[PDB]
Design a protein around this ligand. Sequence first.
Ligand SMILES: COc1ccc2cc(CC(=O)O)ccc2c1
Ligand SMILES: COc1ccc2cc(CC(=O)O)ccc2c1
Ligand SMILES: COc1ccc2cc(CC(=O)O)ccc2c1
Length: 580
Amino acid sequence: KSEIAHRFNDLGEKHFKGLVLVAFSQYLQQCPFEDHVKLVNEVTEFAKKCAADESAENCDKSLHTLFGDKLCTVATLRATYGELADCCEKQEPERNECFLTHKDDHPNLPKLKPEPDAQCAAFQEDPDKFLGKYLYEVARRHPYFYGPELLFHAEEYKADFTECCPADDKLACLIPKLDALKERILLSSAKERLKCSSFQNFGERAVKAWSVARLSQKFPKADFAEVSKIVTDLTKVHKECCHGDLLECADDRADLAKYICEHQDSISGKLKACCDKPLLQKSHCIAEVKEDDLPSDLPALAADFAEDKEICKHYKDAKDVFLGTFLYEYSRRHPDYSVSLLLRIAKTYEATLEKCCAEADPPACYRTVFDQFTPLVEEPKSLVKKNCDLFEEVGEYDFQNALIVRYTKKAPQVSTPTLVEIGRTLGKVGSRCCKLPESERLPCSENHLALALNRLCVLHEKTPVSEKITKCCTDSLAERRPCFSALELDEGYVPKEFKAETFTFHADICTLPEDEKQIKKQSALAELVKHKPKATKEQLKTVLGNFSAFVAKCCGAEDKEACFAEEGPKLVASSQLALA
Ligand SMILES: COc1ccc2cc(CC(=O)O)ccc2c1
Ligand SMILES: COc1ccc2cc(CC(=O)O)ccc2c1
Ligand SMILES: COc1ccc2cc(CC(=O)O)ccc2c1
């Protein structure tokens, strides 16, 4: 009868309000917190009014009709969001489809820096409003954040402020906790942006293929019927809150958590801890659940997928279904393979049957299909061993520096801030994955590379500069990392016009936090590669060493500004000659 009433009844007032605020904040990122709270209230009031008499007028209307109508009431819409105001002319589903399009993944809003004194005072005088502020702030900085996951992260936030506002030291309790949370948000955001990116660019079939591989790894003892059910239900959950249907998304995610936990004995022995937790905790715990031990009775696949004489017959009859089965079974027995590698192997299996089932005697052709996988497995293992050997040797900052040089040579047209952010994110992959048991290194590395490279691809949709990057981002989801790995310096690139002020440093740097200095120095490294792109990585390491030395020296000088002014131009001059 009335959908708005249905969701309000199910989710509760608090969660309904939470998700509705996120939804509004994600669509309208530049509008004030004052304004969003009033739409949140007005909509909520309508849901209560509808939940009372469902037969009331306008209550029959869809969430999209109602949420999109409310978005067109917002003061100064044409002035602030001209691009988004045109959509308000259109009917549904055209209008929401129009809204979704005009979202910003890099809205350049100020860095989210904690103030222990002022925030604790805001939390005390009204916690409900203080938590609302958090949802708003993070939502407009991550327009594709997993809605119910945000409500979960907003509880971690509240848990930190409840612990640290009465405490003796208000900074030393709160500063490293909110930095760890900001770290966790960046990762949750990254995973859920790859999901939405995969829908936008490659489609539902691609997201399903990815989910089959991942869940098969996480739940190896689950039947193919069970894994299919969960993938079907999970893919609909992600499709919904990637498309802004946060009320639908939240309801469906809770149902799937309820399902996985009712059937946990047939799915995995790792879910017992997750299933005895509250609703938001439960959903988060399952999503991040440890992989189940391999079953003793795991079947041999050679007979079914290489030896059997009617494989072509099976394959031809229903391709997507047969391929699903192979993906399911091969992923189950390889928790030591990345998802992208499993999708690569599946695409090589598909290719072998396409070829072999055109020839005179197929069985003799596809008998050795599994041996076509060995080179696909050794390539990534090489790149992980090589990058981890480099990381453990030189550390996060130099490894990051090695990667900024690698990717600035690949895509020198890409902005320095973008190259630096990607180099630094790729550097974290070394820190996170190289320390893990070497069996867990490959999956960790490639699954986090997918996040880092999807970031780069998202930034590159906004400001396209490179046809090589476009091709790597749009061609094939499974072949992305290999595609990016394959890029070399463009021999037809014109070296950056040397601008002296680009490499000019002042005393301002000396007061900066550690990482903020790194960013400034790493920004300079990128600008060096752009001006002298044929310079060896060993040349660049030397020159930036000299830059670091110079900065440390002048920050410790009596007259810091005089030191930068006298030393700086000499260093820049001789740096040009060292990079020949
Ligand atoms: C374990 O950490 C890493 C970090 C960056 C990597 C980059 C690549 C991709 C490339 O070759 O450019 C491959 C493995 C990596 C492993
Ligand atoms: C149903 O089985 C599959 C297996 C591998 C797949 C890989 C991709 C990835 C890509 O096409 O680049 C997409 C769908 C798949 C479906
Ligand atoms: C400051 O520029 C750097 C720093 C460290 C690096 C390490 C490597 C690793 C290597 O030298 O083989 C490569 C480039 C770098 C660039």
